[PDB]
Amino acid sequence: MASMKKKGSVVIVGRINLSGDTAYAQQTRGEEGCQETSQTGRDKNQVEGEVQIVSTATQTFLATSINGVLWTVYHGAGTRTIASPKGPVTQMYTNVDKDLVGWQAPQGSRSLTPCTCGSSDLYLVTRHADVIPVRRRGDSRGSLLSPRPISYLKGSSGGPLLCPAGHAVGIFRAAVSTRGVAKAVDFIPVESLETTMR
Ligand SMILES: CC(C)(C)OC(=O)N[C@H]1CCCCC/C=C\[C@@H]2C[C@@]2(C(=O)NS(=O)(=O)C2CC2)NC(=O)[C@@H]2C[C@@H](Oc3nc4ccccc4nc3-c3cccs3)CN2C1=O
Ligand SMILES: [Zn+2]
């Protein structure tokens, strides 16, 4: 018992910058700082923007702020705390059945507004800051207008699907692939987030 180890915190290591005319990834913390921050849970770095790049000791993926909550996937974060300036912060939402978790949005982040447009022309933002057109095909599915090898999408779970006006429509969860080629994406609809927020 005395030697039982503790899982580290999720650490914000960068962001997908969407503030200007050009989307691009920025790293804000390197690997050594990330490992140390994961162990302490103390992250004094300034946070900006809507889409964060996040890491554990073993995985890297995305997290998206909507309605003052930073949301990501359970298959990436598990039940982990997130590092913050005052120490680790416990999840405020956890739903393994939806593959969804959330923490209070960090100070300095900006939140996306849930979409109320009813529009099916969407855009997926990847961890490499690609903005991919996606046609909505159901409550939780959308098709890529140009298929991609699944390599292209690996590490983008937790990122947003957006409407033409930049509202959040969903959180990217899984790639739908045949023979390694992604022709569609599965996502957590923002309404499911809004319900989880009871
Ligand atoms: C069968 C269907 C049609 C749904 O499609 C698939 O399942 N296709 C699979 C193909 C996997 C091959 C790689 C695809 C590329 C990118 C993928 C975008 C990402 C991604 O980037 N991940 S990541 O960032 O690299 C990682 C964080 C570091 N997503 C995944 O890889 C998802 C994880 C897991 O699904 C779950 N795993 C778990 C594990 C524990 C607890 C709950 C749980 N619930 C889950 C779900 C409930 C509903 C849908 S999934 C399977 N994934 C899929 O995509
Ligand atoms: Zn909208």
CATH code for the domain of 169: 2.40.10.10
The answer on 142 and 108 residing in a single domain is no
The answer on 188 and 126 residing in a single domain is yes
Residue 112 CB partners (closer than 8 Å, separation 6+): 50, 64, 65, 66, 160, 162, 166, 167, 168
The answer on 95 and 125 residing in a single domain is no
Please, what is the Cα angle at 19 between 102 and 11, to 5 degrees?
35
Could you tell me the two tokens for 110?
A: 């900006």
- Give distance in angstroms: CA of 53 to centre of ligand 2: 23
How many CB atoms sit inside 10 A of residue 143's CB? Answer: 17
34 is in an annotated binding site: no
Question: Are residues 18 and 26 in contact, defined by beta-carbon separation less than 8 angstroms?
Answer: no
DSSP code for 6: -
- How far apart, in whole angstroms, are the C-alpha atoms of residue 23 and residue 29? 19
- Give distance in angstroms: CA of 170 to centre of ligand 2: 11
Residue 68 CB partners (closer than 8 Å, separation 6+): 104, 105, 111
The answer on 194 and 122 residing in a single domain is yes
Instruction: Report the Cα–Cα distance between both ends of the chain, in Å, rounded.
Output: 38
DSSP code for 105: P
Using alpha carbons, select from 171, 115, 110 the residue that is nearest to residue 140: 171
Catalytic residue status for 157: yes
The answer on 117 and 103 residing in a single domain is no
CATH number at residue 76: 2.40.10.120
Q: Give me the torsion for CA of 35, 72, 88, 110, rounded to 10°.
A: 100
The beta-strand segments (E) located in 28-109 are 51-55, 60-66, 69-72, 93-95, 100-104
- How far apart, in whole angstroms, are the C-alpha atoms of residue 146 and residue 17? 23
Domain range for residue 108?
1-112
Stated in angstroms to one decimal place, the resolution of this structure is 1.9
Using alpha carbons, select from 74, 72, 79, 78 the residue that is nearest to residue 53: 72
How many CB atoms sit inside 10 A of residue 179's CB? Answer: 6
The answer on 47 and 72 residing in a single domain is yes
- How far apart, in whole angstroms, are the C-alpha atoms of residue 24 and residue 127? 9
Ligand 1 pocket residue status of 74, Cβ below 6 Å: yes
How many domains, in total, are found in the chain? 2
Burial of 49 (0-12, 13-18, 19+ CB in 10 A): middle
Q: At which of 112, 134, 161 does a domain end?
A: 112
Q: At which of 69, 95, 112 does a domain end?
A: 112
The answer on 24 and 1 residing in a single domain is yes
Method: X-ray
